[PDB]
Design a binder for this molecule. Structure first.
Ligand code: 0G6
Ligand code: NAG
Length: 234
């Protein structure tokens, strides 16, 4: 994330970090949903995902840090593009659950649908300048801007797709490489999964795309419950 600071150590207990069995670099984040389920971006998928929960600093371990691996991964299959980017979202089922604690806590799924001009916060362990990865997660605040801004810049995001266009129109504040799959939090609920935006990050007049979690609420809840024939919202 760019144009923000270190996150308060207790503000991100649902933030999980994704890296691969082969590499220690965080390639994406995600959100803990209940003891056994993480929500994240489809393009974050890889062959041997590892998930670190209850982390803040890459270097100073926490009491309650946990490493997990996937047992199930679940996608939208009815997507407007073969690569599935128009609907960048995925659910992972953890091999063993976790137990909650100060730094491990389920985020809250939206309840009402919130829109343009709301105040939202972004977090993650992705890039903070031109080529640096911070060792602690950074956070800042953005707003939902009007979709119009995103459409023209991102083909994979058609008009009236299920996304929130968000950022700071003037530059400085935005997510970046490696933030994918991390929550966009508004009124203490996850309204957003980081999908993408422009490279380099936070450039003038160039908001980013967040999968509108609220739309997938039912899809998410069937998937959790055990249903395997359910489809993503059209
Ligand atoms: C995979 C994620 O780390 C990453 C999120 C980066 C978002 N950054 C900014 N500036 N807000 N997503 C990207 O790499 C995604 C997946 C691959 C393509 N992509 C992009 O951001 C492209 N530049 C195009 C894009 C795809 C989907 C939605 C919007 C834009
Ligand atoms: C499974 O999937 C769909 C959800 O729309 C539906 O046909 C069915 O009611 C679901 N429930 C169960 C218990 O299989």
């Amino acid at each position: 994330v760019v144009g923000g600071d270190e996150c308060n150590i207790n503000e991100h207990p649902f933030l999980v970090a994704l890296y691969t069995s082969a590499s220690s670099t965080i390639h994406c984040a995600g959100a803990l949903i209940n003891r056994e389920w993480v929500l994240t971006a489809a393009h974050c998928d890889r062959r041997n995902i590892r998930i670190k929960l209850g982390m803040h600093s890459k270097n100073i371990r926490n009491e309650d840090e946990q490493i997990r691996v996937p047992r199930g991964k679940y996608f939208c299959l009815n997507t407007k593009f073969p690569n599935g980017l128009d609907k960048d979202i995925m659910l992972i089922r953890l091999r063993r659950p976790v137990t909650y604690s100060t730094h491990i806590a389920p985020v809250s799924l939206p309840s009402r649908s919130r829109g343009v001009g709301s105040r939202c916060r972004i977090m993650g362990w992705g890039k903070i300048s031109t080529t640096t990865y911070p060792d602690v997660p950074h956070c800042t605040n953005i707003f939902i801007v009007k979709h119009k801004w995103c459409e023209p810049l991102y083909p994979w995001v058609p008009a009236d797709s299920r996304t929130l266009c968000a950022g700071i129109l003037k530059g400085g504040r935005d997510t970046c490489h490696g933030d994918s799959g991390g929550p966009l939090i508004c009124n203490g609920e996850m309204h957003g999964i980081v999908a993408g935006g422009s490279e380099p990050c936070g450039q003038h007049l160039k908001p980013a795309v967040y999968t509108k979690v609220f739309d997938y609420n039912n899809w998410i809840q069937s998937i959790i419950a055990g249903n395997r024939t359910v489809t993503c919202p059209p």
